[PDB]
Symmetry: C2
Subunit: 285 residues, 2 copies
């Protein structure tokens, strides 16, 4: 369907729009290139490990690589829906969001290639709870926006994508990586990537907060929907977390070798903490 | 609809894919930030001009600002359609494409703001031929891809967007800017922007060539469709060009003041030249 006109012909960008400001910050802070990361020490680290130690790291990478690829593909309906609503500054910012996620896909895939597991199918580490979130609930909620851009649908999409996948799972994953491999002194290239991803993620989560809050601001009963959609996904969040913890507990050779008292009870509490603080970042009023 | 799996979990990025290579070049060559361009001399240049000289430059900027905004919004269905086909490297590259166009929208809108015309509605310089391309034919061809990603539809979308809007009109616009204002010594910030846009455009056009050629390669009768879709749009291409030429011929005070023998016959021939060389960049065989 046609364009009725163009904002930057009739007027200009809204330079004070929060999402224009975030776009500007993304340009300034988003120059890193996965192609510049030196993975040569990562290759040697991985080769030095025993088979039982090698596998320790793969469930988490399996979760991230699928996660990055899903969100790269699944942000497109959000960009479309806000575009169709004329929210030009949102769209400008979402171009940086999409490109960030492409670089994230690239980073993990370069690490897999470099350490010699690119040929390994890591889908075996996606349990039913993970698939419910990433293979199903995430694309369902985002693709809905092509035919239903109601405030309800937009809140649901931002909740699943920005508040759960990013704001709870990705953030806890970054913490888990540092708690384990930063301690061990392992995988410096991967951990450099993680630091860049974690910095990008701040803007992604801020977009979701802004999107959810601006809809809540119109009608404070959307606050209840946000909470409900958060709670709907929690069983799968913790179900996946419990599955990874069980795998960690059953393959402890990396932890012993590297003197990591890996506190899974504490990682579990960080996830709960993330989930609850994302809820608190939306105001009913 | 769901994800059946993820390429970077089952395997890796296809590192040798042409669109991965283009993505890599876009990261390396796409660091420029419109926010860094110094428009202060542009403001003084524009203020120095008489009213009749001021207006000389506005039809071309009106064409570009709407053009950039349209392509920012209208590339999203192409990204979606290739995503749904599993063409991950194409999608990675298209994130740089989208972000480039966002920066282009930003550049022209910053120039308009800086020279004091942000409040002026430049839609008056879009004639019927321009609207047929940008308000209608471009969004029609791109949005079709949401429900019809047939080789025919993809060739039509790439032809209108990459070969006509970018490969014929944008390229001729860059040439026109340099022929006029680079000569005059005017608007150094705008011309810096034009050089960055022209560099980005090379990758955009290369994406369209690759997309059209890979479909032609499957069935050489799609070559005829490419030619037909090019010729379908030519009347509006030249109809818009003739309209801008007529405006230039009727407001020659900038040209006199600045000693520009503006050769409109030569600009017209450059457009024809662009159109014909884009056709020659697709091989029937
Ligand atoms: C053992 C402790 C459990 C910690 C939780 C680990 C979760 C792994 C993360 C996988 C999903 C990554 C989602 C990426 C989202 C994005 O890139 O925006
Ligand atoms: C007077 C000589 C005519 C020269 C032709 C001028 C055409 C102006 C360009 C306006 C459309 C710009 C399209 C931008 C496309 C993109 O950003 O990829
Ligand atoms: Fe990410
Ligand atoms: Fe993210
Ligand atoms: Fe452009
Ligand atoms: Fe372009």
């Amino acid at each position: 369907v046609h364009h009725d006109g163009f904002q930057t012909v009739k007027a200009t960008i809204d330079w004070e729009h929060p999402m224009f400001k975030l776009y500007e910050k993304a340009k300034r802070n988003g120059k890193w290139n996965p192609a510049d990361i030196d993975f040569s020490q990562d290759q040697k680290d991985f080769a030095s490990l025993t088979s039982e130690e090698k596998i320790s790291a793969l469930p988490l990478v399996a979760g991230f690589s699928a996660g990055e690829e899903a969100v790269t593909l699944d942000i497109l309906p959000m960009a479309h829906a806000l575009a169709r609503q004329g929210r030009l500054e949102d769209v400008l910012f979402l171009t940086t969001f999409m490109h960030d996620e492409a670089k994230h896909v690239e980073m993990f895939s370069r690490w897999q290639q470099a350490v010699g597991i690119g040929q390994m199918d890591l889908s075996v580490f996606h349990n039913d709870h993970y698939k419910r979130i990433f293979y199903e609930a995430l694309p369902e909620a985002m693709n809905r926006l092509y035919a239903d851009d109601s405030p309800e649908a937009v809140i649901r999409a931002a909740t699943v994508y920005n508040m759960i996948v990013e704001g709870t799972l990705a953030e806890s994953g970054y913490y888990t990586f540092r708690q384990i491999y930063k301690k061990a002194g392992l995988f410096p290239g991967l951990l450099q990537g993680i630091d860049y991803l974690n910095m990008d993620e701040g803007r992604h989560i801020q977009f979701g907060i802004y999107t959810i809050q601006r809809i809540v601001n119109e009608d404070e009963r959307y606050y209840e929907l946000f909470i409900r959609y958060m709670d709907e996904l929690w069983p799968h969040v913790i179900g996946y977390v419990d599955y990874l913890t069980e795998l960690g507990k059953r393959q402890q050779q990396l932890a012993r070798t590297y003197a990591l008292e890996i506190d899974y009870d504490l990682l579990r509490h960080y996830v709960i903490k993330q989930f609850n603080l994302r809820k608190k970042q939306i105001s009913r009023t």
